Amino acid sequence: HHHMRVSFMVAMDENRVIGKDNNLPWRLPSELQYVKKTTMGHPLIMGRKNYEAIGRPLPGRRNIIVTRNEGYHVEGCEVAHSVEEVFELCKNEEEIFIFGGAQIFDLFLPYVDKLYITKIHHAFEGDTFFPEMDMTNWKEVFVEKGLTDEKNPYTYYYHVYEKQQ
Ligand SMILES: NC(=O)C1=CN([C@@H]2O[C@H](COP(=O)(O)OP(=O)(O)OC[C@H]3O[C@@H](n4cnc5c(N)ncnc54)[C@H](OP(=O)(O)O)[C@@H]3O)[C@@H](O)[C@H]2O)C=CC1
Numbered sequence: 556h557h558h559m560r561v562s563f564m565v566a567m568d569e570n571r572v573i574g575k576d577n578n579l580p581w582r583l584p585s586e587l588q589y590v591k592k593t594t595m596g597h598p599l600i601m602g603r604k605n606y607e608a609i610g611r612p613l614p615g616r617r618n619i620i621v622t623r624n625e626g627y628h629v630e631g632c633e634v635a636h637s638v639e640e641v642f643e644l645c646k647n648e649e650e651i652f653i654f655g656g657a658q659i660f661d662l663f664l665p666y667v668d669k670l671y672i673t674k675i676h677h678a679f680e681g682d683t684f685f686p687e688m689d690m691t692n693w694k695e696v697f698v699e700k701g702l703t704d705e706k707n708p709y710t711y712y713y714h715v716y717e718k719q720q
């Protein structure tokens with residue numbers, strides 16, 4: 556139905572960990588620079604817990620917060636309460652980025668077209684995971700080594716996948 560391309564933005568470890576105590580388990584500013592680069596001028600779709608961990612709006616992108624809380628408001632952000640209400644707010648967007656966390660990944664699971672996933676080669680302690688996925692009809696179309704250095708102390712790779720509709 557939806558006219559906008561539903562994309563997933565995620566970084567996860569060797570065991571699909573994406574979260575530790577409502578926080579990222581690693582510090583990788585270069586990966587965030589890639590995220591900022593890839594997502595510029597596009598909607599970011601965030602579960603309320605994800606947004607509040609980030610703490611403030613992110614520049615040059617539509618910020619959309621998913622919550623059941625009907626009284627919930629945030630400055631320079633937009634609040635949706637259902638997948639459909641998002642599709643409404645995004646009815647004229649070309650591409651949209653589901654940005655997390657896990658509950659919000661689960662929610663949009665059946666709608667994903669494209670998949671921007673950063674794979675990190677390390678086993679972090681974590682409580683929050685990226686959902687298991689049926690990769691039938693999916694094709695890896697891109698992969699490249701991330702920048703490892705003093706400020707980015709881990710080995711990671713940028714993967715992009717596309718569902719053959
Ligand atoms: N490594 C990565 O790429 C990423 C990691 N993370 C990490 O993941 C963790 C957060 O994930 P998680 O705990 O799942 O939190 P979420 O970001 O998914 O927040 C879930 C919230 O969204 C709202 N919500 C959930 N389902 C619905 C629904 N069906 N309808 C309306 N609103 C709904 C609820 O908000 P409310 O209770 O207010 O109504 C719920 O508390 C953190 O550790 C974070 O740092 C997050 C993004 C990316």
Ligand SMILES: COc1cc(Cc2cnc(N)nc2N)cc(OC)c1OC
Binds near residue numbers: 564586590608654655
């Ligand atoms: C850009 O800053 C943040 C980003 C994220 C989520 C995230 C991080 N990386 C990737 N590849 N995908 C994602 N969805 C989660 C955060 O929570 C701590 C952030 O705050 C610093």
